[PDB]
Amino acid sequence: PQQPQQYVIQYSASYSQQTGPQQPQQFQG
Amino acid sequence: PQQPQQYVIQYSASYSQQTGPQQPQQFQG
Amino acid sequence: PQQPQQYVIQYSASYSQQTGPQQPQQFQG
Amino acid sequence: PQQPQQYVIQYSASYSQQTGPQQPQQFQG
Amino acid sequence: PQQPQQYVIQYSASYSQQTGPQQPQQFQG
Amino acid sequence: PQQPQQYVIQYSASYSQQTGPQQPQQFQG
Amino acid sequence: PQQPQQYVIQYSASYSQQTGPQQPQQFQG
Amino acid sequence: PQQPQQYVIQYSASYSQQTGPQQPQQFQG
Amino acid sequence: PQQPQQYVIQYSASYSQQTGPQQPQQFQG
Amino acid sequence: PQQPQQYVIQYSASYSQQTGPQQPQQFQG
Amino acid sequence: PQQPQQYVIQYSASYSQQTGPQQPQQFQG
Amino acid sequence: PQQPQQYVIQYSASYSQQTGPQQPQQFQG
Amino acid sequence: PQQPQQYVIQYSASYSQQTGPQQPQQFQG
Amino acid sequence: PQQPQQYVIQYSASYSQQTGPQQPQQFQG
Amino acid sequence: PQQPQQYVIQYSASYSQQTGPQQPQQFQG
Amino acid sequence: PQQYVIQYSASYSQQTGPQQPQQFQG
Amino acid sequence: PQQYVIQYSASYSQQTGPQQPQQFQG
Amino acid sequence: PQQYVIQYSASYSQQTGPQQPQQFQG
Amino acid sequence: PQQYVIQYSASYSQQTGPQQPQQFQG
Amino acid sequence: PQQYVIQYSASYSQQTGPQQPQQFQG
Amino acid sequence: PQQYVIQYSASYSQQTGPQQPQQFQG
Amino acid sequence: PQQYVIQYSASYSQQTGPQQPQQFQG
Amino acid sequence: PQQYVIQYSASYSQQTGPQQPQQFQG
Amino acid sequence: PQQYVIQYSASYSQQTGPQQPQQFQG
Amino acid sequence: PQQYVIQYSASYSQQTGPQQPQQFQG
Amino acid sequence: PQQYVIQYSASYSQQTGPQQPQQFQG
Amino acid sequence: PQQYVIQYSASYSQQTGPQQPQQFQG
Amino acid sequence: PQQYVIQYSASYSQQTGPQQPQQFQG
Amino acid sequence: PQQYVIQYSASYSQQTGPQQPQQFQG
Amino acid sequence: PQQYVIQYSASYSQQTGPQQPQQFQG
């Protein structure tokens, strides 16, 4: 029972911003 | 029973923004 | 029983926006 | 029993928008 | 029993919009 | 028993719109 | 029962921003 | 029962920012 | 029951910033 | 029951900054 | 029941700064 | 019940700074 | 019940500074 | 019940400084 | 109940400084 | 005024269709 | 005025469709 | 005015669809 | 004015979908 | 005006979805 | 005006999703 | 005006998700 | 104006998520 | 104007998450 | 204007997270 | 204007986290 | 203007974290 | 303008953390 | 303008941390 | 302008930490 869990989360509020891209890599096997 | 879980989430509220693209890669096998 | 799960989610409210494209790649086999 | 699941979701409310295109690729076999 | 599932969903409410096109590609075999 | 399932859905309500075209490609064989 | 958990989280409020990209790598197997 | 837990968190408020990228690597096996 | 826990946290408020990147490595096995 | 705990924390307020990167290494096994 | 605890903390306020990087190493086993 | 505790702390206020890096090593086993 | 405790602390205020690095080593076992 | 306690502390105020590095070694066992 | 206590303290104020390094060694066992 | 949208999957069955209704009252 | 959207998965069953309703009252 | 969105997974079952409703009252 | 979003996982079951509702009152 | 977002995991069950709601009152 | 975000893990259960709500009142 | 974010772990259970809410009043 | 962030770990349970809320009043 | 951040560990339990809130009043 | 950050460890329990809040009043 | 940071260790308990708050008034 | 940092160790308990607050008034 | 840093060790207890606060008034 | 740093060891207790505060008034 | 550094050892107790404060007035 293999269950790898990867959470990549970006959020912002009240006159904010995020510029960077999201590039995650998950390798099983 | 192999269940890899990848969560890529972007959200924003109240005069906010996100610019970066979402490019995730999942490899099984 | 192989069940890879990939979640790519963008949302925004109250005068917000998202500019980046969504380009996910899932490889099984 | 192979069941790969890919969820690409964009939504917005209350004077919001999404500009990026949706281009997901799923490879089985 | 091979059942790949790809969900591409865009929706918006209350003075919102989505501009990007939907171009998903699914390859089996 | 091969059953690939591709869902491309656009909807909007309450003074909303969607501009992008829908161009999905499904390849079996 | 192997369950590796990786949390990558960026958020900001009240006239703030984040510039760096998110590039995490998870290797199981 | 192996459960490695890695938390990478960046946040900022009230006219602040973070510039560095997030590049964590987790190796199990 | 092996549970290694690594916490990498950067935050700042009231006209502050952080420049350095986050590059943690966790090795189990 | 092995539980190694490593805390790497940088924060600053009121016209302050941190420049150095965060590169911690945890080895179990 | 082995619980090694390592705390690496940098903070500053009121027109201050920290330049040095954080590179801690924890070896169990 | 082995609990080694190592505290490495740098802080400064009111027009101060710290230049040296933090490189602690903890060996158990 | 073995609990070795090592405290390495540098701080400064009102136009002060610390230059030396922090390199403590703790050996148990 | 073995509890060795080592305190290494450097501080300075009002136009002062400390140059020497901190390199303490604690051996138990 | 063995509790060896070693205090190494350097401080200075009002246009002062300390140059020498701190290298204490504590051996129990 | 009552509006009911119900999707019910009985035992040993599979339902794949998404559920996305629009309900306007008043 | 009551609006009910209910997705119910019985025992030994699988439901894959997302749940995304839009409800406007008044 | 009451709006209910309920996702219920019975015993020995799997639900995979996300829950993302939009509710506007007044 | 009451808005309820409820995700309930019964015994020996798995729910994987995220919960991300948007609620506007007044 | 009351807004309730509730995620409830019953006994011997697993919930993996994140909880990230947006609530605007007035 | 009351906003409630509640994550409840019953006995012998595991919840993995993060809790990150945004609440705007007035 | 009351905003409540509550994370509750019952007996013999594990909660792993971080708690990071943003609350704006007035 | 009252804002409550509460993390409660019941008996024989483990909570691992950090607590890092941002609260703005006035 | 009252802001409460409370971390409570009941008997025979372990809490590992750090407590680092940011509170702005006026 | 009152800001309360409270970390409470009940009997026969362990709390490991650091306490590092930032409080700005006026 | 009152700011309270309180760390309380009940009987037969262990608290390991450091206490390092930053408080700005006026 | 009152700022209180209090570390309290009850009977038969151990507190190991250092106390190092920064307080700026006016 | 009053600033209070208090470390209190109750009966049959041990406190090991150093006390090193920085207080700036005016 | 009053600044108080107080270390108090109750009966049958041990305090090991040094006391080294920095106080700037005017 | 009053600055108080007080170390108080109650009956049948041991205090080992040195007392070394720095006080700047005017």
Author numbering:
A (entry chain I), B (entry chain M), C (entry chain Q), D (entry chain U), E (entry chain Y), F (entry chain 2), ...: 262 to 290
P (entry chain 3), Q (entry chain Z), R (entry chain V), S (entry chain R), T (entry chain N), U (entry chain J), ...: 265 to 290
Can I see the authors' text?
To perform its role in clustering vesicles, TFG self-assembles into homomeric cup-shaped octamers via interactions encoded in its N-terminal Phox and Bem1p (PB1) domain and a subsequent coiled-coil motif. Within this region is an LCD (residues 237–327) rich in proline, tyrosine, and glutamine that functions to further polymerize these octamers into larger assemblies and phase-separate. Mutations in the TFG LCD are associated with degenerative neurological disorders such as Charcot–Marie–Tooth disease type 2 (CMT2) and hereditary motor and sensory neuropathy with proximal dominant involvement (HMSN-P).
The mC-TFG-LCD-G269V fibrils have a uniform morphology consisting of two protofilaments of the same sequence (although one has three more residues resolved than the other) but slightly different structures and interacting through a class 4 zipper interface (parallel, face-to-back, up-down packing). The fibril has a pitch of 578 Å, a left-handed helical twist of −3.07°, and a helical rise of 4.93 Å. The fibril core contains 2 protofilaments, 1 with a wide core of 29 residues (P262–G290) and 1 with a narrow core of 26 residues (P265–G290; 3 fewer residues resolved). Each protofilament consists of a single dagger-shaped β-arch and constitutes <30% of the LCD. The disease-relevant mutation G269V is present and buried in the interiors of both protofilaments. V269 resides at the center of the longest β-strand of each protofilament and fits tightly with side chains from the opposite arm of the β-arch. Thus, V269 excludes water from the interior of the protofilaments and contributes to a heterotypic steric zipper. In the mC-TFG-LCD-G269V fibril, the wider protofilament core contains four prolines and the narrower one contains three; one of these prolines (P285 in both protofilaments) is directly across from the mutant valine residue, participating in a hydrophobic interaction; thus, the valine is compensating for the structural weakness incurred by the presence of the proline residue. For the mC-TFG-LCD-G269V fibrils, we found that the fibrils remained present after being heated to 70°C, but dissociated after being heated to 80°C.
